[PDB]
Amino acid sequence: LDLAGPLLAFLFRGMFKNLLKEVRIYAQKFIDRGKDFNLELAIKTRIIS
């Protein structure tokens, strides 16, 4: 039986992977330009919540 914990763990796995993907994309643009991207701006807070 899958309770609340395992289900939320599956969802959070997916959403954290998406968050890291978005960080990768946003930082890659700035790295290509040669600017030293800010980590706080890269993180899209809305994804997980």
Add this chain to the structure above:
Amino acid sequence: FGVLAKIVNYMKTRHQRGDTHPLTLDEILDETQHLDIGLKQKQWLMTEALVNNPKIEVIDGKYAFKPKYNVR
């Protein structure tokens, strides 16, 4: 080899003058402020390679008549 394409541009402006006459490489190199040494020999090897594909016509004798269509 780049100086060679520059010589091609020079003879193109020479056509633009309309006073085109049978020439040679030494006078062009002098008027374009360049010397006559073994460098001219290697660039003349390149220039003969050019004479193998001189759509801008550069023949050895009486020459330089580029335009495939040319009357005035």
Add this chain to the structure above:
Amino acid sequence: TNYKPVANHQYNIEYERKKKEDGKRARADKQHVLDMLFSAFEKHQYYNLKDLVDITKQPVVYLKEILKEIGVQNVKGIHKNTWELKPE
């Protein structure tokens, strides 16, 4: 502490300082630009406009004018239509 108020982001100020120190590329004389272009072509036959701009260190409009004077754009199966530094 997160998202603390800053007048300007550190990376942006570093990038702006670098750009200001470098300055805009100056429009050099036609003769010198042409000579540099011919040497570049001597390296090998085909150049893209972006890297040619990098090599010549000239304004894009001025370089494009000088290149249109002699060079010609060829549509090619390499990736796209690019410039040809051979005048003919």
Add this chain to the structure above:
Amino acid sequence: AQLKFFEQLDQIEKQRKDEQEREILMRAAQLRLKQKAKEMQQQELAQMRQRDANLTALAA
């Protein structure tokens, strides 16, 4: 002068040996070709570097 021609022939043998005695070192890990390529690259820098000399002489 005839002796100088012989010395030039010896320098040609020395350049062949150096180019070929290691066109082999590269294989063990075309040297002449690489050197030629390197020489081609400098030409563009040299002149960009060089005509600055002409204007600086005019400036000073």
Add this chain to the structure above:
Amino acid sequence: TVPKLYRSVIEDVINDVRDIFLDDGVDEQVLMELKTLWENKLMGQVEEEPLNSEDDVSDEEGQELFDTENVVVCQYDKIHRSKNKWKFHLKDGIMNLNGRDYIFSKAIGDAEW
């Protein structure tokens, strides 16, 4: 001190020109002769087009022509000016003051216009 630096410069120059003297095929005695001679030598106007209405609006241009006075040749890292004063971060260079030569690494200057 400065003469010792000059001798070190002599050594560097000869070492740097040896390879060129070999490249051009010239004999090495040229360098010795060069060093010898170098050392010996050392030791209501409505119609406003006419600008002639004003005269003597310039200064003597012979200073730059003469250049006989003391001369400083160096490299500059930063040069700032704020409406009156010129500020100078001139880096390593050479100075020729009253014939005697001076050597420096960091030069700081403030001048008024």
Add this chain to the structure above:
Amino acid sequence: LSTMIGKGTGAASFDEFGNSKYQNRRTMSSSDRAMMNAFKEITTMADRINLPRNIVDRTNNLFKQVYEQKSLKGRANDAIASACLYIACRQEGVPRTFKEICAVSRISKKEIGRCFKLILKALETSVDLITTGDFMSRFCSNLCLPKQVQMAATHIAR
């Protein structure tokens, strides 16, 4: 007035080398795509400082008016969005300092201020002057000061 297509079932949907959905759907116009991207950036910036959704909607309306008015077409989008967010916070009565907006936006404070002036001129509107009491609650809470200390600071400033 559009739709979009998915994978569907597994059969003729994917063809010779996996054609997918015959295509990629390819919808809309720039006069809406740019506005959409600006809306996404506005939501991100607001969530960075936990701004409420009403301020987000006011920012979206301000940005729509500015974007259609087009006096700031030369200014980069993110600067316009940040200035609109600042103006919406000012109009809602909970102002954020220019530095606070710059903390969550890639745009510098100077550019945000210039676009703020330009947006004020384009909208022909105005924002009430900020007072020391506007920032007291947020500053004190972020410093974790007691309520009495916050009241004392507000009274001292006023």
Add this chain to the structure above:
Amino acid sequence: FIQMSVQRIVEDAPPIDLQAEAQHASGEVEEPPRYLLKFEQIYLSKPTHWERDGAPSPMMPNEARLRNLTYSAPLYVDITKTVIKEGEEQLQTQHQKT
């Protein structure tokens, strides 16, 4: 979930590796910098509600029921960022509780 699975999901994710695409067209002997990000040490705060003023305050469950708020808690992660520019020096800046 909160105590173990969130932290394990953060740790299991591979580090982010980023580098420029041969920027500046120079000699390019690994010249483009390498940026490495590694997430660590997730932190959770108590449920908090931020007002229109932006001032954080604890969110009681009944207030969430009455005002149709969502009972949620902030989630913070330590991130370590390393820059390798092939300048013989690597700098590992750490961002705390992002």
Add this chain to the structure above:
Amino acid sequence: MAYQLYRNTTLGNSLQESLDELIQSQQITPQLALQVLLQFDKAINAALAQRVRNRVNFRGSLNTYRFCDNVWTFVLNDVEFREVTELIKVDKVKIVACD
């Protein structure tokens, strides 16, 4: 084909005069003389960059200035070159700078 700053100084002038004497004597070709000058410029630049580790100061007034092709041509008057070890006074100076 180099920076070419120190040629118009005592050292460069002496080197140029020596090269002129050898050219008059036919001992060296003008191309060789030019090569020697280029090598001297490289060596002198390196030597001043490396073996000089002293900090100097100066003050005064400026009468003229010029800039072109990254070449400053300042012209100062009544300059006082102050150093921790010695102080030098000069009525006029011309500062030529490049980079």
Add this chain to the structure above:
Amino acid sequence: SGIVPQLQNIVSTVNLGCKLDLKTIALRARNAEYNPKRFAAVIMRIREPRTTALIFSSGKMVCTGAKSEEQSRLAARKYARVVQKLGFPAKFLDFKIQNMVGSCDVKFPIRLEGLVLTHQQFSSYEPELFPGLIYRMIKPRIVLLIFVSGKVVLTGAKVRAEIYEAFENIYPILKGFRK
């Protein structure tokens, strides 16, 4: 009112009517500087009028720093004559004063808060960006920087009459908000 603004800077543009070589001008002029990487014009300064002029290859020149209209015209003529002495056919064509800047003091502190509250349509007071209040007068197209210390700076004027009229308009308004 008993107070008249005094000009602090005047900007005037004049066309020489002939193309110029910026490099030659930089090499031959006395106080001129030319950095094409930084700016596309040539910056020259003359001390006797205490002004600075920018000279462009198109033959148009901008003179700034003059405290008076006569000083501006004389400085522009001097720069044109310097360029002419360098061999160019420089002339003096369509000389015009593009902008004038004036400063003055009202000699009393001002409540900028009340001023912006009363004249919000023309006022702009943002202490975060700039401590001085920006007032955009309409009848004369003048922008006034009003400060709590009482200093007032006027800009955007083409003639001295605009400066004086703008100050005359603003003075009763400021007197209404004396601190």
